[PDB]
């Protein structure tokens, strides 16, 4: 039921907060990749694969072909499929428990999907732009 306040930065996390799977997929796309490259491939992925139920059943080679030439597309395709499967079948409390979700994905989830932002200390440039803005404006 948590609604993260809307910032002037319009991070992709702010668009996808309502669907934790979509937000976490966005972190897999954005992790060690520029937004200019990641963002359009991200929407094309979500358009063909709108849910974890659809992504977990895919052949990674077909996901990979869509992801080309985004850096390390084969690894990323395999990560997306195994993560989508774990997302559904595991009784996880935090996404850090899932395959392919590191501190960056967990910080994004704890800022946007659950109301734990005050306890989060991000290391990502964009997350910190949002997080710092939210520290300055939360009472207003």
Backbone shape: globular
Record field, number of beta strands: 0
Number of structurally distinct domains: 1
Instruction: Name the helix and strand elements from N-terminus to C-terminus, one letter apiece.
Output: HHHHHHHH
CATH secondary-structure class = Mainly Alpha
CATH architectural label: Orthogonal Bundle
| CATH fold assignment | Endonuclease III, domain 1
> What is the SS-derived class?
mainly alpha
User: With helices defined by DSSP (H or I, 4 residues minimum), what is the helix count?
Assistant: 8
CATH homologous superfamily title: Hypothetical protein, domain 2
Question: Whole-number radius of gyration?
Answer: 15 Å
Textual characterization of the structure:
It is classed as hydrolase. This protein has 140 residues and is mostly helical. Helix content is 59%, strand content 0%. The radius of gyration is 15 Å and the shape is globular. α2 (20-30) packs antiparallel against α6 (73-89), α2 (20-30) packs antiparallel against α7 and α5 (60-67) packs across α6 (73-89). It is built from eight helices and no strands.
């Amino acid at each position: 039921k948590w609604t993260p306040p809307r910032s002037p930065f319009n991070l992709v996390q702010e668009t996808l907060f309502h669907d934790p799977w979509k937000l976490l997929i966005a972190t897999i796309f954005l992790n060690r990749t520029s937004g200019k490259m990641a963002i359009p491939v991200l929407w094309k992925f979500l358009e063909k694969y709108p849910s974890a139920e659809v992504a977990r059943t895919a052949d990674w080679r077909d996901v990979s072909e869509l992801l080309k030439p985004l850096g390390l597309y084969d690894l990323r395709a395999k990560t997306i499929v195994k993560f989508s499967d774990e997302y559904l079948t595991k009784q996880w409390k935090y996404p850090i428990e899932l395959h392919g979700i590191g501190k960056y994905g967990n910080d994004s989830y704890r800022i946007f999907c659950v109301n734990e932002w005050k306890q989060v200390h991000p290391e990502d440039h964009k997350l910190n732009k949002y997080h710092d803005w939210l520290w300055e404006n939360h009472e207003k």
